[PDB]
Design a protein around this ligand. Structure first.
Ligand SMILES: CCCCCCCCCC(=O)N(CCO)C[C@@H](O)[C@@H](O)[C@@H](O)[C@@H](O)CO
Ligand SMILES: CCCCCCCCCC(=O)N(CCO)C[C@@H](O)[C@@H](O)[C@@H](O)[C@@H](O)CO
Ligand SMILES: CCCCCCCCCC(=O)N(CCO)C[C@@H](O)[C@@H](O)[C@@H](O)[C@@H](O)CO
Ligand SMILES: CCCCCCCCCC(=O)N(CCO)C[C@@H](O)[C@@H](O)[C@@H](O)[C@@H](O)CO
Ligand code: NA
Ligand code: NA
Ligand code: NA
Lengths: 256, 256, 256, 256
């Protein structure tokens, strides 16, 4: 229909995106002002009405999209489903309303592309992340059995051990706060903690670098495709096509 | 005119740059000596006169440049505008006079190229930086509402929360100083702080690596252009021109 | 024989790997539950029987493999030898039974490939690691002689000095906890500690980056070979073969 | 002469390097044992004689080299000059004798190549290092003037400010130890310290990454040259030579 097509063009315009972005920012500002515990009853009531107005504008925006794309066509996108859930959970009584400021990511295409690159890079580091998880679990069981009776606040149970080993991997007071006090009772505890630090810092840096390198390459391809319609072909494909042109001319020269 | 041309050649010489660099260093040294609170009145007066002499030499230098390049031609460069502002603000009464040691960057071309590469890499990481800003704002609102009444020095208001979340992202006493004391009152606070650390450290490292990788490539191109007049063409352009030469010879062999 | 061939196909199936993986996870869960010191005698007895059952399943699995591959054929693989040692040490009475959760790495091929890439990258960083070791040894001898009599808990002997220099390299309380107290007695101690930090942080980051970059490239080749049978040839080999095709056609055109 | 040639072949053999390496290790071990303050007079005397024996073996080694290469030919190498200085300073009475364990780097060629790559990468990061130095100097002058009277232990003078800003750049107790106590007196001090941290951590990581990336590439070329006599030509040179072969065959086909 012509009407649904005029609505799609309104939705996909730069001005509509700018208005929705401004309402997300306004809603985020009123939720930030609502943290101020010194506000008067009238000021709080006013800010709650601005929040209610912002939420109504998002309802109109979402309904406008579902009509212009169709129920199955709208829910086909993960970003639209996210926008729908974020707005729908506010209707029908979580206390974390500030999470709808995440709509700045879903509404702005360049920010959406950064997050997409990070999410798409996750499967590729799954085995490095599983290796770190295995090391953490093994270390937490060992630390609990080794130090739980003598240092129960840090290692009294599996949950406590996982927490203090995460602190140890981040290098936060690992020695003055944790390992020197442990070594006063268990002199060889450095044999456990120093290899734990070497392994986890190497593995977490491998995990982070793997995410970053891949996310940057995916996002760069997505930026190229969003502007020109296509991305730069990999150097391997360029060299493959160069070799194909050489086979075509070699078959020639030989007998032609 | 011949005079303006002789002045331009004086300004663009290696000896003039070396003299201006020496005056910036001398001015920086006298401002560093002026921090010593034990100095006599005569010693302070002497150093203030050396500072005044340095500032007069920069006025002569700047005027010499504005005459030799023209008002619009001088202000066409951002570095010249910076040099002009830095010297002009000293005339007419900020207390931070030490900021004119930044002229070492604007005067030395290799240092100027490092800063240029860093500034030019900023637009390309704008979406990663905006994502970190969104995460910080959301986390600061949540932390204020969750912990502000029980830990008001760290999370009593939005400003306090942003400050302590910046400390938490840098891993500084995050656990022994902040999260273990918070968990004594809110046992599940690790559910907030550990994902906050994982997300912000990954995102800030993505931001820093993106700046560094791009700044290094831009600065390297600028060094090449400043020495030879041109930079190394990207491998994609070399492979494109190689494919063009193959099309020219294939059209040949086929029927020639 | 046909029987050994039917057993090999059972062992190499996805379902057999999934069952062995589930038994490793179950054994890891019962060893994690056994850390809970509040368990009843009956609960502990039950968990010890589940652990015994898991260990028997691994014995059947290992025996099944040794028969289907031969004694020399099974021990030809380092992963099979690891699986054998891990299970065999449990029979005949270390207290660290949780180390058999490392079998998740040896049993899952994608996790095995991550560890293989890390182990294979170690020879290539051996000289960077030896340089860090030389710097640590020299610094520990100097720190012991310089500060051992005045700060014996941190530098009283070589072992203590190596431990506190490892803490200093990780930047943990290096200044508020170690160097400011040392400088109260030895004012120029920053001349030792600040160059030590600059050198070791640069060298350890070189060591970690060298491991990560190489492990990622080796693991990526191993993933390619495990799926297609071969890996992507290096760009140097592609350009070498491209130059060979040009020599074949140049010898032609010249006189043909 | 034949004798000098037989001596050069002895010096350049793998067995002579292995003997000199073993004497460096032995000398390092006796200097490490000499740190033990509980040793008897006889044990100390014995270790000092082993140190004296090691030093005599290095004198014979150095003299053997100066005769076999000539005075100007020996001193032509920076490593030989280093080996000469290190041994010669021990004769004629620094207390840091442990520095002759640095001869492990000069004697072992693969370790020598790592250090060479790091030294050769230094000129290329000189402008990034100068930028960090300029930022540190400016910040130290500002911090001294801003906080020196209220926090004289940390910022009382330029030297104190440089030290605590180096601690702040390493993120060590930057907030709980330095900036929160400063903000109790100067509430806006975060406006100084947070941009200082952002700038210096970005710049020091740029400095470290620039050193590492270049040192790794130089060392890899040096390893290739030491084994085969030549290094891998850069991809740019391979593509340049590929384009030259295309010009030779295009001039042909056109009219041949
Ligand atoms: C891979 C990273 C995994 C990090 C998270 C692991 C710990 C999660 C469980 C947990 O933290 N607790 C269990 C829920 O009660 C709370 C405590 O057991 C523990 O945090 C102790 O530190 C307490 O003493 C705090 O007061
Ligand atoms: C993205 C990074 C953003 C980091 C900076 C955010 C905080 C900026 C505002 C601010 O720090 N203050 C507001 C100006 O008054 C001061 C305090 O609210 C706060 O710093 C508390 O820590 C006080 O208790 C200090 O004494
Ligand atoms: C390359 C990294 C090497 C790091 C490990 C070096 C130290 C290993 C030896 C060691 O730590 N000790 C010797 C065994 O007794 C124990 C103590 O000498 C020392 O840890 C002191 O800190 C004590 O005061 C602890 O209570
Ligand atoms: C680019 C990195 C530069 C870091 C090094 C800068 C400081 C060097 C000078 C120095 O540290 N001192 C001057 C020599 O006396 C000593 C003290 O002024 C200072 O260290 C204070 O912390 C004292 O209170 C220690 O007790
Ligand atoms: Na700390
Ligand atoms: Na740190
Ligand atoms: Na600390």
């Amino acid at each position: 229909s012509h009407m649904s097509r005029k609505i799609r063009d309104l939705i996909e315009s730069k001005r509509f995106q700018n208005v929705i972005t401004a309402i997300i920012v306004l809603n985020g500002a009123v939720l930030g002002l609502l943290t101020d515990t010194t506000l008067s009853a009238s000021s709080q009531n006013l800010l709650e009405r601005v929040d209610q107005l912002c939420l109504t504008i998002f309802i109109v925006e979402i309904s406008l999209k579902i009509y212009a794309y169709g129920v199955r066509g709208f829910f086909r996108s993960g970003w639209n489903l996210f926008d729908f859930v974020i707005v729908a959970i506010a209707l029908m009584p979580r206390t974390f309303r500030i999470f709808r400021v995440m709509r700045l990511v879903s509404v702005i295409p360049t920010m959406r592309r950064v997050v997409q690159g990070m999410l798409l890079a996750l499967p590729g580091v799954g085995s490095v992340a599983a290796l770190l998880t295995v090391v953490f679990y093994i270390a937490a069981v060992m630390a609990t059995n080794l130090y739980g009776a003598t240092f129960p606040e840090w290692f009294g149970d599996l949950s406590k051990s996982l927490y203090t080993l995460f602190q140890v991997m981040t290098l936060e007071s690992w020695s003055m706060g944790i390992v020197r006090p442990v070594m006063n009772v268990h002199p060889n505890a450095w044999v456990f903690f120093i290899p734990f630090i070497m392994l986890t810092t190497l593995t977490v840096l491998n995990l982070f670098i793997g995410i970053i390198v891949d996310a940057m390459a995916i996002t760069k391809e997505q930026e190229e495709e969003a502007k020109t319609g296509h991305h730069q072909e990999p150097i391997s494909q360029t060299l493959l096509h160069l070799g194909d042109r050489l086979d075509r001319i070699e078959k020639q020269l030989a007998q032609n």
